[PDB]
Curated annotation (Swiss-Prot), chain A:
Residues that bear N6-acetyllysine: K16
GO CC terms: cytosol; extracellular region; ficolin-1-rich granule lumen; membrane; nucleoplasm; nucleus; proteasome accessory complex; proteasome complex
Keyword set includes Amino-acid biosynthesis: no
Parent-protein start and end of this portion: 283 to 376 of 376
Family, per entry: Belongs to the proteasome subunit S11 family.
Complex formation: Component of the 19S proteasome regulatory particle complex. The 26S proteasome consists of a 20S core particle (CP) and two 19S regulatory subunits (RP). The regulatory particle is made of a lid composed of 9 subunits including PSMD13, a base containing 6 ATPases and few additional components.
Record-given protein name: 26S proteasome non-ATPase regulatory subunit 13
Keyword Acetylation: yes
Swiss-Prot record, chain B:
Record text on subunit structure and interactions: Component of the 19S proteasome regulatory particle complex. The 26S proteasome consists of a 20S core particle (CP) and two 19S regulatory subunits (RP). The regulatory particle is made of a lid composed of 9 subunits including PSMD7, a base containing 6 ATPases and few additional components. Within the complex, PSMD7 interacts with subunit PSMD4 through their respective MPN domain. Interacts with TRIM5.
Organism: Homo sapiens (Human)
A Gene Ontology BP annotation from the UniProt entry: proteasome-mediated ubiquitin-dependent protein catabolic process
UniProt keywords, alphabetically: Acetylation, Isopeptide bond, Proteasome, Ubl conjugation
GO MF annotation list: protein homodimerization activity
The protein's name: 26S proteasome non-ATPase regulatory subunit 7
Covalent cross-link Glycyl lysine isopeptide (Lys-Gly) (interchain with G-Cter in ubiquitin), where: K176
UniProtKB/Swiss-Prot annotation, chain C:
Protein's name according to its UniProt entry: 26S proteasome non-ATPase regulatory subunit 8
Glycyl lysine isopeptide (Lys-Gly) (interchain with G-Cter in SUMO2) cross-link, renumbered residues: K63
Disulfide-linked positions: none
Subunit structure: Component of the 19S proteasome regulatory particle complex. The 26S proteasome consists of a 20S core particle (CP) and two 19S regulatory subunits (RP). The regulatory particle is made of a lid composed of 9 subunits including PSMD8, a base containing 6 ATPases and few additional components. Interacts with DDI2. Interacts with TASOR.
Superkingdom of this protein's organism: Eukaryota
Its biological purpose: Component of the 26S proteasome, a multiprotein complex involved in the ATP-dependent degradation of ubiquitinated proteins. This complex plays a key role in the maintenance of protein homeostasis by removing misfolded or damaged proteins, which could impair cellular functions, and by removing proteins whose functions are no longer required. Therefore, the proteasome participates in numerous cellular processes, including cell cycle progression, apoptosis, or DNA damage repair.
Similarity comment: Belongs to the proteasome subunit S14 family.
Swiss-Prot record, chain D:
Subunit and partners: Component of the 19S proteasome regulatory particle complex. The 26S proteasome consists of a 20S core particle (CP) and two 19S regulatory subunits (RP). The regulatory particle is made of a lid composed of 9 subunits including PSMD3, a base containing 6 ATPases and few additional components. Interacts with UBQLN1 (via ubiquitin-like domain). Interacts with ERCC6.
Protein name in UniProt: 26S proteasome non-ATPase regulatory subunit 3
Protein function: Component of the 26S proteasome, a multiprotein complex involved in the ATP-dependent degradation of ubiquitinated proteins. This complex plays a key role in the maintenance of protein homeostasis by removing misfolded or damaged proteins, which could impair cellular functions, and by removing proteins whose functions are no longer required. Therefore, the proteasome participates in numerous cellular processes, including cell cycle progression, apoptosis, or DNA damage repair.
Family designation: Belongs to the proteasome subunit S3 family.
Cleavable signal peptide: none
Parent-record interval covered: 438 to 486 of 534
């Protein structure tokens, strides 16, 4: 659910979502790290979890348009840098 | 199984002139031939090749004709002149792979259990390599079939031998690199990389456009790989990354500073030497 | 006196002129100086008492302090004022160099390998 | 002191209610961009000569 930016989440959020108290949540994430479902690292003194990689999943046809738009405004940066580098260093060889 | 394949220019020239001499007769679309080469470790080398009579109908993709006796006797005939070569696979000059490729590969897998398919483009228009290398394999998934035959790509490159190198050097009189230095290190590496990356992104754009409006055969492995791609982009706004970047750049510039200083000193020395040596030449004429 | 920050002498001498009236220009200088002192106080302070502004700026209690604060908005009352400063805009971004430094390196390469 | 602070001469702050001036300490100039410029200038000079 959370975006790639600001993926850090707290213990109390897990406690409320999973309907358990705090003292077990570590073990839960431990299990989630053991079987390789999710990859990350966990802190204890500050009650924070740093989540990094989660398994992919299937999704409908109205969600891939987001990836299409992301490619849309991704290709333009490459094109712009191409043009800038080509024009700036022209006389180095015609 | 196979890691890299190396292709000599001889087979490229043979492909080109075979295509020319067989397409001049009539309007054929695809031609087929068999390659010869060698193995060492996991690296494959291709040396030479010869053609073979092949026929295919555009009406249906399930009818085609090859010659067995021709291939057998021609291999036997090339055996008597050089015994080091051996059958390794085949090539077809189609712009893109066809449906019948699996059937032909199965047909001539008899002569080589590790046949490798090679596609050569006869009229390239870009800077990419003209050759593509594929190998058969059996793939397994959840439902539909326990195994299915599928091609997988293998890295290819163009090699050269000493005699071949001197021949191609004699043939390429007109075109030769201007300078070797930062020029060839920059344009031949960076701008071409931008070109290729943009082309790849455009192709994947096209495929994604084909979905959710048109045909729509939603495939899931492509989606998984797209998620993996879009998840692996690094973040360059982090403070520690910026600090490390600045530290390394500042560390690197001092060396260029020093080298420029040395060059200036050497230039001054050369100027002094020339002026002193040349001022003592006018009085000798009297 | 005006070139540096010393301002008390300016208003002290403004009531002491041996030449003539000169009142057509001292008022303009007073307005400009009061405006720039207001501008300066806005920086480097997060807390100040209300009467301290009346002491620093020579209008004592003419009701002009509240209208003057209407001119220079300020934030809070309770005999206090507050200001906020960021100044982190220039740091924490390496994208802004990414182009000008590329241009600089391209220039080095261009003037390093051309035959003159 | 205020006039000096405003033009960027120093980076300190003063408390009118208390009286003392609390200087701001921030040092790590090698991570700053400026050495790059301080080298760019001399590099360009040595390339011109």
């Amino acid at each position: 659910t959370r975006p790639a930016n600001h993926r850090q989440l707290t213990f109390e959020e897990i406690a409320k979502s999973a309907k358990i108290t705090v003292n077990e949540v570590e073990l839960l994430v431990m299990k989630a790290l053991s079987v390789g479902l999710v990859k990350g690292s966990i802190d204890e003194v500050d009650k924070r979890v740093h989540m990094t990689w989660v398994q992919p999943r299937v999704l409908d046809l109205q969600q891939i348009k987001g990836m299409k738009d992301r490619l849309e405004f991704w290709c333009t940066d490459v094109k712009s840098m191409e043009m800038l580098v080509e024009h700036q260093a022209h006389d180095i060889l015609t | 199984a196979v890691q890299k394949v190396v292709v000599h220019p001889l087979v490229l020239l043979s492909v080109v002139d075979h295509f020319n001499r067989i397409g001049k007769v009539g309007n054929q679309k695809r031609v087929v031939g068999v390659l010869l080469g060698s193995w060492q470790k996991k690296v494959l080398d291709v040396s030479n090749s010869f053609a073979v009579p092949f026929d295919e109908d555009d009406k249906d993709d399930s009818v085609w004709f090859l010659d067995h006796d021709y291939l057998e006797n021609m291999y036997g005939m090339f055996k008597k002149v050089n015994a080091r070569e051996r059958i390794v696979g085949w090539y077809h000059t189609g712009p893109k792979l066809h449906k019948n490729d699996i059937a032909i590969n199965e047909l001539m897998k008899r002569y080589c259990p590790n046949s490798v398919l090679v596609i050569i483009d006869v009229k390239p228009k870009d800077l990419g390599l003209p050759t593509e290398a594929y190998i058969s394999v059996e793939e397994v998934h959840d439902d539909g079939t326990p195994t299915s035959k599928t091609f997988e790509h293998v890295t290819s490159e163009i090699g050269a031998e000493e005699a071949e190198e001197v021949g191609v050097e004699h043939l390429l009189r007109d075109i030769k690199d201007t300078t070797v230095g930062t020029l060839s290190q920059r344009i031949t590496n960076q701008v071409h990389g931008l070109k290729g990356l943009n082309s790849k992104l455009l192709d994947i754009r096209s495929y994604l456009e084909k979905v959710a409006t048109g045909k729509l055969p939603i495939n899931h492995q492509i989606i998984y790989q797209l998620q993996d791609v879009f998840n692996l982009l690094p973040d360059v706004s982090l403070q520690e990354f910026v600090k490390a970047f600045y530290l390394k750049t500042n560390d690197q510039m001092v060396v260029v500073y020093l080298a420029s200083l040395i060059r200036s000193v050497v230039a001054l020395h050369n100027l002094i030497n020339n002026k002193i040596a040349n001022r003592d030449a006018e009085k000798k004429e009297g | 006196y005006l070139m540096e920050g010393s301002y008390n002498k300016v208003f002290l001498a403004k009531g002491n002129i041996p030449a003539e009236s000169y009142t057509f220009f001292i008022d303009i200088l007073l307005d400009t100086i009061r405006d720039e002192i207001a501008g300066c106080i806005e920086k480097a302070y997060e807390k100040i008492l209300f009467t301290e502004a009346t002491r620093i700026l020579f209008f004592n209690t003419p009701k002009k302090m509240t209208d003057y604060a209407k001119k220079r908005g300020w934030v809070l009352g309770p005999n206090n004022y507050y200001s906020f400063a960021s100044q982190q805009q220039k740091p924490e971004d390496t994208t802004i160099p990414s182009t000008e430094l590329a241009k600089q390196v391209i220039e080095y390469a261009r003037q390093l390998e051309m035959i003159v | 002191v205020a006039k000096a602070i405003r033009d960027g001469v120093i980076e300190a702050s003063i408390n009118h209610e208390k009286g003392y001036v609390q200087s701001k300490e921030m040092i790590d100039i090698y991570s700053t961009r400026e050495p790059q410029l301080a080298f760019h200038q001399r590099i360009s000079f040595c390339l011109d000569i």
